[PDB]
Design an enzyme around this catalytic site. Structure first.
Site, mmCIF file in Angstrom:
data_model
loop_
_atom_site.group_PDB
_atom_site.id
_atom_site.type_symbol
_atom_site.label_atom_id
_atom_site.label_comp_id
_atom_site.label_asym_id
_atom_site.label_seq_id
_atom_site.Cartn_x
_atom_site.Cartn_y
_atom_site.Cartn_z
ATOM 1 N N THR A 134 0.855 -1.179 0.000
ATOM 2 C CA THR A 134 0.000 0.000 0.000
ATOM 3 C C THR A 134 0.894 1.233 0.000
ATOM 4 O OG1 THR A 134 -1.917 1.059 1.032
ATOM 5 C CG2 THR A 134 -0.187 0.245 2.479
ATOM 6 N N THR A 135 0.288 2.383 -0.283
ATOM 7 C CA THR A 135 1.048 3.608 -0.485
ATOM 8 C C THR A 135 1.572 4.172 0.833
ATOM 9 O OG1 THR A 135 0.985 5.821 -1.470
ATOM 10 C CG2 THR A 135 -1.010 5.051 -0.359
#
Lengths: 113, 44, 179, 242, 235, 229, 123, 215, 172, 196, 239
Positions: free
Chosen positions: H42-43
């Site tokens: 995920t970012t």
């Protein structure tokens, strides 16, 4: 022979199972070789000789190989007294699940076998 | 026996005596620290 | 090859651990259980090594083991074989030896833990059996209703099942099949 | 003398003086007692560390647990005793992992005695100055009791004693022991009498018992109230025997 | 003053530490063995009774394989290592060859193991002496003996331990073909030879026996007392 | 004849080099350790008492973890090599079990390390004895380790030079139910009993341990405590 | 080594005196005065100063080759007292340790850390 | 045991590789399923404002390295956790020995060397960042052992939008609140939950005190 | 000084009360008392039988007694088994008369070791095995056995040896 | 194609195997024993590739014999099974192509009869009956249909004959001579061969 | 009287600044029979004096063979001579195999000295107790060398070593003027005449205790024993 050793395949010993096996098995030797080469090229022949003499003198006072040792002076000389690696926390050698006969291992250390 | 396996020939008495003596002249891992207390007498 | 399925829940001062129809649930202590799924030989080897380490620990320190410490120990044991891994997925459920508080968790084959407050499930069927369990769980369920709920979930998700109910005083073991 | 410097020197009449001195160093420690009964085994010990400013941590200072079926007592040097106890625990766990069955007592004793003997043969090392007593239960021979020496020698007994004033205790046990008719209570009374003769307060002794109850071994440590009651009963009986 | 190192020669050519190990062997307990026509007998004499002891844990006769057995005299702790080494070597040779071991082969291995420990100043020799009897694969009885130096020989009958000269003289005087004909005769000969040096018998004698394809058997006090009484009846 | 070799038993069955190492320990600076009902106090007397000394260079009282401290009496160089190993062992235990190490386990491991140097030829035993304090599960702990590798559990002890008189003093005025401030006062008095000089806040060190964790007292607090005695 | 150890309370480094004194260390301490010179170091408010004696007794020597002030690093200076060969060897060891610390950690070694490492090696 | 001559050693063990290769081949041929590792892709993002660092992630995951250093990981979870714990323990030992708070460059060097020792088989991409006696720093580390010192870093699955936002609305000497808002918008642009932020400020640190072990 | 301180062929065989007879259409003479048969790679067969022969000679010198057929066959099998899966190819029959009567064994590169009474390998050896099984017995005549072997060879389509209590001879 | 059958009753264990070798290069008589004797009351029959199966059996046999010699009393079936499982698991991790299948049977004075099943990946299991070979599924189905912990030796041999007859009905070719044995409180009692 | 503590080891310096074990080892060369070597502009020869223990024995070999152009003579211990000969043979064979070019005599002697120096500085060893005379031919012409137990070598031109070698050395020193302009027959005659001085003035140089080794430009190393030395001996005069 043939009872003190077994389940060994010659054709399965020439080819390593993983790319990382040999590098992990021989990390300390390669590190020492690199350090000694750099030191010898920078300062001279005397420094690696002194270092090897100190290592040999320190490594010669330990317990017999069927009991775990601490290796305090060697770790002080090497500098590993303030660093923790994966060799310290994984698969503790002080609680090994297999061990051989005392006399046989002492004889094997001397090289009589 | 090794000589026969390698060459198909019988070793000379002098050669076998030399091969034996090559072992007993080294002392001081498996080598002893004292001389061998034995004397041999080959022939044939 | 099936793999099986191991499941866990907790309620009011009680937990439940269940499996399908080879032994899968191994007792480690007085009120602490572990369940494994996957290859049979890996399950047996992991159970034996864990018993070895736990026995040495309890003998040396002279006290019982907390569930969190067992989770950390099994995580370290699994992570030892990081490159060539064991094919197991442990599940731990038990009560604290002194406080008597429920505890459930899960791990992967490498050793990444996951502590959960309501329920834990692992095995070859994890995508399903999740929504039904989420819809079938209620907070603070008493022993008998906990057993009914976990048996219903195990039977509806999938022959026979085995259910362990462990409490502060008594431990109940039951085996049942769909009628 | 000339032949009294290393462990690897034979006297001109076949003796090992360093091993003799290692065995002689035992006679300075406390008194450890052990007697085998008809339905259990017993252990008794002497507390040499009894001071007003000493804490009471841990279960016992001289009685250790090795596995689910065995215990031991030591007499000698504590620094070596700790290493020996750790190695014993490791050996038992290794055998259990190997065979999925608990280790027999004689096998455990032999495994430790090999290690103890290994230091009396290779030069440059000092022998272990520790003597041990073993108790346990086995499915092959039942209740058992053993003894070990610094030289690596062992043997099975029925009533033995090591430590300070061992000769008097052995003589009294030989005089007052009955073959095949000792109950646990009689063994406790005999142990109390022997300890009283060879040394009474209830804060100077430690007593442990091993029994089989419903298929499982139980190892207990007697309480201060129980040992005080035993002492009082023995004193009353001795007074009434006048 | 040349006797404080293992690998140092005397001016007249003597190694003294090996002789001191032999002296240590010399003070053990008497062990006697006799090789018969179809049987082999071993026997040792017991030390102080130590009434509060388990007699099973202390024995000086051991079995190495299904056709080889052993007795020793000397230091008790050192023999327990050699016995285990020989026990392992028997099975290793069984894997190697598929044939049962030979008495000479196992004796040679034990002698080599004993010799290995008299070659450096960092270790001390084994202070034990052994008597090995057994049956070969051809059914021929054998009897050997080793020394702490590392030498072995084949005997018809001999003895070791303390008080062995008188026992050996008695065996020389009274060993013949007329007292070896039967197993009972051989056992009586061994018992008499042991009685020549021990005190009142029947309680200080441990005796074993092994026939062809019959494995080792340990005689019990009832049979020992029966044999002793039978001897006593014979004037 | 038996006094020069580390691996030789005397005819009486005694090891003499270990006794001489103990004598070496018994000639250092005094140390005091008292455990109260809610904590443990440690004190010692410094060696560099001159003005020419930076106060933030070397300390005799060292922390091992958040809840463990340690002080010594003996040879200074043989102390750092043990402190570093103790810290490494504590970190290894935390990494393996995800929980701070108990005091007893650390004492056992340090004693095991110390014992190794008294069985092989070519080395000499450590010439230092250690005092260790901790707090686990709402309980204070106090230990002590000999150069021979044997450890005891104490309630109030004093080691170093002139320690028998200190032990008698402590036995004379030790109370089972004592607060931490009273323990600090008693430790200061015991240290003063054998000082040979004028005691000041700049030549003694004091460390305390409670539920908050191990902490080394600042010179201002030491002076404040001294002014009340 | 196979040379053994000399017998005596002094004369060996691993033998304790009847009251636990190591005498070879004290003799090594006495060995410092063999040179015959004295060194002084004083720390100011914002500076440090090292002053040592210089003694050349021979007119055939090159005075530029006689010195006791060394440079371990661009920011660290040293002065040595005692045997000349031992001093130079210890300077070389200190330089090696500083380089190794720089490589392993990524910034210049502090003075206290360097002194502690040298003392740890000497112990 | 009879088949043991040399004492054992610690570390990783390579025993099941030969068995696992053929087992996986046969199972893939027969169409069976085997357990798989867990990934946490995920970012994540980070930026430098005037006198501090701001880290962010979406859902805590910002790991703890030191009282002044924090990290964010992407990839396999177990490797990230173990590497972070090992680095934290080593830095704690170093700080106890030295007596001063550690430097960011030390952590970067240790991480780079460890990740280079194992040639990419320990998959963990990190976003290191902290404040020390010199000043604020942050770096990005890749599983093969490559480090970059940048003013702003983004990493993870939704990284294109975050990099676009950084290139659009960045300027030197950012204020704390507006830097936090910029990070929040950059992270939120990647999903279309709530996000977490960690702020390391110069004013909340003291570099003139002896080191004390944190809770 | 300081640095020094640191550091297309068909074969058959069978046995009975009067020894072992081996026939072919090559045969290696291992020992005056042990006889072997080659099948497969020539170099491998030659090298490995030579090694077996020297080891048997060493054993006889050490123990002052001739080796047994079972021991020799087991030794050869163990020696071959180490290099398993390396491309070795051999099929051999070991025949001899040591004690307890004659013995016949077979051993190959894979690791097989079978003790039997009749053996036959190579190409069209099925017909030879069938005819010998039809004409097999235990108590026969030496000339009868020679005739049976000749008939088996003829049906399969000459080298013939006989092993007795004191060595082996060649008749044709 | 090789076949292994095993049934254990209240006080006995019945073991059946085949009598045909796997050789295909040289022609010999099919008679070849396959059961291995470890001790006076333990029997191990194992099937797989030739060359290493016999080596494994010999290694286990020698280890058990050495244990008996060192200690003076024999191993139990459970300990022998666990030791064999550990050794097989250790050996399989070296030789990657390795197929050895085992069944272990024995009698113990303390516990009683035992029959252990072990697959080719070293997964031990204690079962009332087991089978290895080609018609394993059909044989296990027939055994499950006809079984109870009350049968005698005659009932067990009749059930085995019924299983063999069903296998022949499915396909009647081959059917080697086979061989059966019985493990009881008095030792390994060999039983009459059923070539059928 | 003060030598007791300072002469049991080779790693100990005496207060006078001497090592006594090296001198003691050097004393061992004088325990063997005398050997003589000399050279000319083309050839180099070696002459030795064999000695038998009794009548019923064969005289031991004093001249060994190393390569096609190098030969040695020994005096002192025998195990050390064998070890040194093995080392020389290995070095020559390795050099020939690798470079396809004969190993030069100077390099061989330097290697010998470097190898021999080591056991005179470290513990647990003792100096070699053998002295050597090496004769060879290479691109620089004939050569002759001497080796000492103290790891010292001299590039001599006519030298003799062994017991009672002073008379032979004196004769060689006197007659060294007329050696370069001579051929093989009179070169060997000069060598034999020099060697004869060692014996007492009652014996004779019979054809039973003489060994001769000859190397040259087009002639490889050759050893003559028993009846092979007859052509080299008839021309000698009386004493």
């Amino acid at each position: 022979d043939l009872l003190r050793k077994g389940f060994s395949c010659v054709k399965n010993e020439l080819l390593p199972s993983h790319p990382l096996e040999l590098s992990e098995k021989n990390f300390q030797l390669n590190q020492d070789k690199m350090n000694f080469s750099t030191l010898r090229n920078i300062q001279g022949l005397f420094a690696p000789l002194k270092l090897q003499m100190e290592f040999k003198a320190v490594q010669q006072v330990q317990r017999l190989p069927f009991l775990s040792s601490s290796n305090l002076s060697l770790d002080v000389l090497r500098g590993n007294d303030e660093t923790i690696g994966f060799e310290d926390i994984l698969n503790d050698p002080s609680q090994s699940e297999v061990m051989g006969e005392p006399h046989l291992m002492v004889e094997y250390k001397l090289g009589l076998l | 026996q090794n000589h026969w396996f390698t060459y198909n020939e019988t070793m000379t008495v002098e050669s076998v005596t030399q091969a034996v003596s090559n072992l007993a002249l080294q002392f001081g891992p498996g080598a002893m620290s004292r001389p061998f207390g034995v004397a041999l007498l080959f022939g044939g | 090859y099936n793999g099986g399925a191991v499941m866990a829940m907790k309620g009011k001062n009680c937990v439940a651990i269940a499996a399908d129809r080879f032994q899968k649930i191994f007792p480690m202590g007085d009120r602490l259980y572990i369940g494994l799924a996957g290859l049979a030989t890996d399950v047996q080897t992991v159970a034996q090594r864990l018993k070895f380490r736990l026995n040495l620990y309890e003998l040396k320190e002279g006290r019982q083991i907390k569930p969190y410490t067992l989770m950390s120990m099994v995580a370290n044991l699994l992570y030892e074989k990081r490159f060539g891994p064991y094919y197991t997925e442990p599940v731990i459920a038990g009560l604290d030896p002194k406080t008597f508080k429920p505890f459930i968790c899960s791990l992967d084959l490498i050793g990444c833990p996951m502590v959960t407050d309501d329920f834990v499930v692992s095995g070859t069927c994890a995508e399903q059996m999740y929504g039904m369990c989420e819809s079938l769980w209620e907070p603070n369920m008493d022993p008998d209703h906990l057993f009914e709920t976990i048996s219903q979930a195990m039977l509806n998700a999938v022959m026979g099942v085995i259910v362990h109910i462990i409490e502060k005083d008594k431990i109940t073991t039951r085996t049942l099949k769909a009628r | 003398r000339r032949y009294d410097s290393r462990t690897t020197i034979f006297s001109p009449e076949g003796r090992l003086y360093q091993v003799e001195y290692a065995m002689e160093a035992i006679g300075h420690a406390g008194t450890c007692l052990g007697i085998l009964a008809n339905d259990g085994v017993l252990l008794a010990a002497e507390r040499r560390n009894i001071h007003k400013l000493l804490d009471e941590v841990f279960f016992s200072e001289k009685i250790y647990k090795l596995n689910e079926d065995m215990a031991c007592s030591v007499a000698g040097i504590t620094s070596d005793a700790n290493v020996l106890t750790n190695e014993l625990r490791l050996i038992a766990q290794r055998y259990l992992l190997q065979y999925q069955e608990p280790i027999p007592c004689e096998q455990l004793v032999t495994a430790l005695c090999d290690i103890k003997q290994a230091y009396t043969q290779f030069g440059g090392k000092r022998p272990f100055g520790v003597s041990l007593l073993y108790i346990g239960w086995d499915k092959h021979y039942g209740f058992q009791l053993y003894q070990s020496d610094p030289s690596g020698n062992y043997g099975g007994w029925k009533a033995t004693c090591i430590g300070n004033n061992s000769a008097a205790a052995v003589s009294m046990l030989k005089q007052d022991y009955k073959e095949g008719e000792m109950t646990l209570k009689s063994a406790l009374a005999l142990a109390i009498k022997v300890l009283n003769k060879t040394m009474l307060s209830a804060e100077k002794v430690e007593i442990a018992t091993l029994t089989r109850e419903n298929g499982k071994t139980v190892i207990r440590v007697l309480k201060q109230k129980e040992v005080e009651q035993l002492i009082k009963k023995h004193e009353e009986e001795e007074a009434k025997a006048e | 003053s040349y006797d404080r190192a293992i690998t140092v020669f005397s001016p007249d050519g003597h190694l003294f530490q090996v002789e001191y190990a032999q002296e240590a062997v010399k003070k053990g307990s008497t062990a006697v063995g006799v090789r018969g026509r179809d049987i082999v007998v071993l026997g040792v004499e017991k030390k102080s009774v130590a009434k509060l002891q388990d007699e099973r844990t202390v024995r000086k006769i051991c079995a190495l394989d299904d056709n080889v057995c052993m007795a020793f005299a000397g230091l008790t702790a050192d023999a327990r290592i050699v016995i285990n080494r020989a026990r392992v070597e028997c099975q290793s040779h069984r894997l190697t060859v598929e044939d049962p071991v030979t008495v000479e082969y196992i004796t040679r291995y034990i002698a080599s193991l004993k010799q290995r420990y008299t070659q450096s100043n960092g270790r001390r020799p084994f202070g034990i002496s052994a008597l090995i009897v057994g049956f070969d694969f051809d059914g021929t009885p054998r009897l050997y003996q080793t020394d702490p130096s590392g030498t072995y020989h084949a005997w018809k009958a001999n003895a070791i331990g303390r008080g062995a000269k008188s026992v050996r003289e008695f065996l020389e005087k009274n060993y013949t073909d007329e007292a070896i004909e039967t197993d009972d005769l051989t056992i009586k000969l061994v018992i008499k030879a042991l009685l020549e040096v021990v005190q009142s018998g029947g309680k200080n004698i441990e005796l074993a026996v092994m026939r062809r394809d019959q494995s080792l058997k340990i005689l019990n006090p009832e049979e020992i007392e029966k044999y002793v009484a039978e001897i006593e009846k014979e004037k | 004849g038996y006094s020069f070799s580390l691996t030789t038993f005397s005819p009486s069955g005694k090891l003499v080099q270990i006794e001489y190492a103990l004598a070496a320990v018994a000639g250092g600076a005094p140390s005091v350790g008292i455990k109260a009902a809610n904590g443990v106090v440690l004190a010692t007397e410094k060696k560099q008492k001159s003005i020419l000394y930076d106060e933030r260079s070397v300390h005799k009282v060292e922390p091992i973890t958040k809840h463990i401290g340690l002080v010594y009496s003996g040879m200074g160089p043989d102390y750092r090599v043990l402190v570093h190993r103790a810290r490494k062992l504590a970190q290894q235990y935390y990494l393996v079990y995800q929980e701070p190490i108990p005091t007893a386990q650390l004492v056992q491991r340090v004693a095991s390390v110390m014992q190794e140097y008294t069985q092989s030829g070519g080395v000499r035993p450590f010439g230092v004895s250690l005092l260790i304090c901790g707090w686990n599960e709402g309980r204070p702990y106090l230990f002590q380790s000999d150069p021979s590798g044997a450890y005891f559990a104490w309630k109030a002890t004093a080691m170093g030079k002139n320690y028998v008189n200190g032990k008698t003093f402590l036995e004379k005025r030790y109370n089972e139910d004592l607060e931490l401030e009273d323990a600090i006062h008693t430790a200061i008095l015991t240290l003063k009993e054998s000082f040979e000089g004028q005691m000041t806040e700049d030549n003694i060190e004091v460390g305390i341990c409670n539920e908050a964790g191990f902490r080394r007292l600042t010179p201002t607090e030491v002076k404040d405590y001294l002014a009340a005695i | 080594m196979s040379r053994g150890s000399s017998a005596g309370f002094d004369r060996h480094i691993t033998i304790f005196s009847p009251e636990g004194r190591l005498y070879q260390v004290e003799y090594a301490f006495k060995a410092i005065n063999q040179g015959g010179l004295t060194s002084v170091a004083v720390r100011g408010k914002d500076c440090a100063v090292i002053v040592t004696q210089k003694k050349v007794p021979d007119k055939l020597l090159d005075s530029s080759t006689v010195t006791h002030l060394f440079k371990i690093t661009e920011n660290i200076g040293c002065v040595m007292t005692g045997m000349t060969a031992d001093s130079r060897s210890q300077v070389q060891r200190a330089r090696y340790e500083a380089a190794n610390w720089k490589y392993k950690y990524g910034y210049e070694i502090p003075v206290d850390m360097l002194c502690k490492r040298i003392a740890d090696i000497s112990q | 045991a009879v088949s043991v001559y040399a004492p054992p050693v610690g570390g990783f063990s390579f025993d099941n590789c030969r068995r696992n290769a053929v087992l996986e081949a046969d199972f893939a041929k027969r169409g069976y399923k085997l357990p798989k590792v867990r990934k946490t892709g995920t970012t994540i993002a980070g930026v430098v404002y005037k006198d501090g660092i701001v880290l962010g992630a979406d859902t805590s995951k910002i790991h703890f390295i030191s009282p002044n250093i924090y990290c964010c990981g992407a990839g396999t979870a177990a490797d990230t956790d173990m590497t972070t714990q090992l680095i934290s323990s080593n830095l704690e030992l170093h700080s106890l020995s030295t007596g001063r708070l550690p430097r960011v460059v030390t952590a970067n060097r240790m991480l780079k060397q460890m990740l280079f020792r194992y040639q990419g088989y320990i998959g963990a991409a990190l976003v290191l960042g902290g404040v020390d006696v010199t000043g604020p720093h942050l770096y990005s580390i890749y599983p093969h052992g490559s480090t970059d010192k940048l003013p702003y870093v983004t990493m993870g699955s939704g990284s294109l939008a975050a990099m676009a936002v950084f290139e659009d609305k960045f300027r030197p000497d950012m204020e704390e609140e507006e830097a936090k808002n910029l990070v929040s918008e950059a992270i939120a642009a990647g999903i279309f939950s709530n996000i977490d932020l960690c702020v390391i400020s110069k004013n909340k640190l003291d570099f003139l005190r002896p080191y004390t072990v944190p809770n | 000084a300081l640095a020094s301180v640191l550091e297309g062929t068909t074969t058959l065989a069978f046995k009975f009360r009067h020894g072992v007879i081996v026939a072919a259409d090559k045969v290696i003479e291992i020992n005056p008392y042990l006889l072997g048969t080659m099948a497969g790679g020539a170099a491998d067969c030659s090298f490995w039988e030579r090694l077996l022969a020297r080891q048997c000679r060493i054993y006889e010198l050490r123990n002052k007694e001739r080796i047994s057929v079972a021991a020799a066959s087991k030794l050869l099998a163990n020696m071959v088994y180490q290099y398993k899966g390396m491309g070795l190819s051999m099929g051999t029959m070991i025949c001899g008369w040591d004690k307890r009567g004659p013995g016949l064994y077979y051993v190959d590169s894979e690791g097989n070791r079978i003790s039997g009474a009749t053996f036959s390998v190579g190409s069209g050896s099925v017909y030879a095995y069938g005819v010998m099984d039809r004409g097999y017995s235990y108590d026969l005549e030496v000339e009868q056995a020679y005739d049976l072997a000749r008939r088996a060879i003829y049906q399969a389509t000459v080298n013939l040896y006989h092993v007795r209590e004191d060595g082996w001879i060649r008749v044709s | 194609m090789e076949y292994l059958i095993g049934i254990q009753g209240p006080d006995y264990v019945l073991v059946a195997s085949d009598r045909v070798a796997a050789s295909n290069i040289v022609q010999m008589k099919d008679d070849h024993d396959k059961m291995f004797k470890m001790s006076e009351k333990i029997l191990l029959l194992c099937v797989g590739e030739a060359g290493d199966t016999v080596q494994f059996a010999e290694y286990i046999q020698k280890n058990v014999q050495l244990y008996k010699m060192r200690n003076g009393y024999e191993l139990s079936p459970t300990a022998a099974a666990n030791f064999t499982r550990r050794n097989l698991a250790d050996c399989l991790r070296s030789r990657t192509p390795y197929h050895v299948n085992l069944l272990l049977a024995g009698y113990d004075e303390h516990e009683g009869p035992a029959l252990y099943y072990m697959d080719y990946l070293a997964a031990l299991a204690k079962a009332p009956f087991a089978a290895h070979g080609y018609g394993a599924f059909l044989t296990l189905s027939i055994l499950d249909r006809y079984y109870t912990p009350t049968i005698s030796r005659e009932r067990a041999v009749e059930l085995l004959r019924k299983c063999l007859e069903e296998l022949q009905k499915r396909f009647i070719l081959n059917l080697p001579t086979f061989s059966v044995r019985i493990i009881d409180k008095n030792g390994i009692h060999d039983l009459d061969n059923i070539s059928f | 009287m003060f030598r007791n503590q300072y002469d049991n080891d080779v790693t100990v310096w005496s207060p006078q600044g001497r090592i006594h074990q090296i001198e003691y080892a050097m004393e061992a060369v004088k325990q063997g029979s005398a050997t003589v070597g000399l050279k000319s502009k083309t050839h180099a020869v070696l002459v030795a004096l064999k000695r038998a223990q009794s009548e019923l024995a064969a005289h031991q070999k004093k001249i060994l063979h190393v390569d096609n152009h190098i030969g040695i003579s020994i005096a002192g211990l025998t195990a050390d001579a064998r070890l040194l000969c093995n080392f020389m043979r290995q070095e020559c064979l390795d050099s020939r195999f690798v470079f396809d070019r004969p190993l030069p005599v100077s390099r061989l002697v330097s290697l010998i000295g470097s190898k021999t120096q080591i056991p005179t500085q470290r513990y647990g060893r003792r100096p070699y107790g053998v002295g050597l005379l090496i004769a060879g031919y290479d691109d620089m012409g004939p050569h002759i060398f001497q080796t000492c137990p103290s790891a010292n070598y001299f590039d001599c031109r006519a030298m003799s070593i062994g017991a009672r070698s002073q008379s032979a050395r004196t004769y060689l020193e006197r007659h060294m003027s007329e050696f370069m302009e001579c051929n093989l027959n009179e070169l060997v005659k000069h060598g034999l005449r020099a060697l004869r001085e060692t014996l007492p003035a009652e014996q004779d140089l019979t054809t039973k205790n003489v060994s001769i080794g000859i190397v040259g430009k087009d002639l490889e190393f050759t050893i003559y024993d028993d009846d092979d030395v007859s052509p080299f001996l008839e021309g000698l005069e009386e004493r």
